[PDB]
């Protein structure tokens, strides 16, 4: 299947030729809506945009934008709202994407702050009695219980739509471990943390999209995406050794540009899916 193309391209050192080859292939689309200067405060790097056509649209007449994209896998039957990782003036509107989009839970790679500097806005109360309220969207969201684990926190938080009263409960699944600088040295903390999100059914076709995001929401996100989905179809195929990392991700770019930022990501994707496999298959 692939394991072997992944040491053939070890011995060969080609993680970077191979990569290049996806930045080239990958698809171009407009984002028109993006690059209005109207919406410049709600985006964080300028060359991280989500396509007009897999936008994601907020149910507000007065500005509908956010940078965030539906990436829907037809074959896989499954589909992740990939987003950057909120600004202090996007956090009402990272909320009310989950609520719109009846989304049961949000997955993110990073950490508030990483090298010193800020990745993303606190969007979450950190304490029970101090729940945040975002004005501009008016939402409640409170910090209902935590749990903290070696590398990945769990919280249960409450979204609540103060418009109606209607509150709805929020899975908050935080990889805290990914290195610094490059990539986990064993995809074995990333795949438990993946398997964890599917446990709780935030994956499941049940309920709305569920949000993955980090610093740009296209490097670790897409790590995180593009190995549920190739694990997923190595499960369905007739045959497994069919499922092409390298296509998927071209799949998946025609919905988000970017996803996976560097050949060591790339690399180790291939890494974690074969791992995945292996953990699954017998």
């Not at 709805?168 to 903390?189: C, K, M, N, Q």
Request: glycine share 4%.
């Amino acid at each position: 299947e692939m394991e072997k193309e992944f040491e053939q391209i070890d011995k060969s050192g080609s993680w970077a030729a191979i990569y290049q080859d996806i930045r080239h292939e990958a698809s171009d689309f407009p984002c028109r809506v993006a690059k209005l200067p109207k919406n410049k405060n709600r985006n964080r790097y300028r060359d991280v945009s989500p396509f007009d056509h897999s936008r994601i649209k907020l149910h507000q007449e007065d500005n509908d934008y956010i940078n965030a994209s539906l990436i829907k896998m037809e074959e896989a039957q499954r589909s992740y709202i990939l987003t950057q990782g909120p600004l202090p003036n996007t956090c009402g509107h990272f909320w009310e994407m989950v609520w719109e989009q009846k989304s049961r839970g949000v997955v993110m790679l990073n950490r508030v702050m990483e090298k010193g500097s800020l990745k993303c806005a606190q969007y979450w109360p950190q304490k029970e009695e101090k729940e945040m309220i975002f004005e501009d969207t008016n939402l409640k969201l409170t910090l209902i219980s935590e749990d903290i684990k070696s590398y990945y926190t769990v919280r249960q938080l409450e979204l609540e739509n103060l418009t109606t009263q209607e509150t709805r409960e929020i899975l908050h699944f935080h990889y805290t471990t990914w290195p610094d600088f490059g990539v986990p040295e064993s995809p074995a903390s990333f795949l438990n943390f993946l398997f964890k999100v599917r446990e709780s059914g935030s994956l499941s076709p049940e309920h709305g999209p569920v949000v993955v995001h980090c610093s740009a929401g296209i490097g670790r996100s897409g790590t995180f995406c593009l190995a549920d989905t190739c694990l997923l179809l190595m499960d369905k195929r007739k045959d497994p050794s069919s499922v092409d990392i390298k296509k998927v991700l071209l799949e998946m770019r025609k919905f988000r540009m970017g996803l996976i930022q560097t050949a060591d990501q790339l690399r180790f994707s291939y890494l974690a899916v074969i791992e995945g496999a292996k953990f699954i298959m017998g």
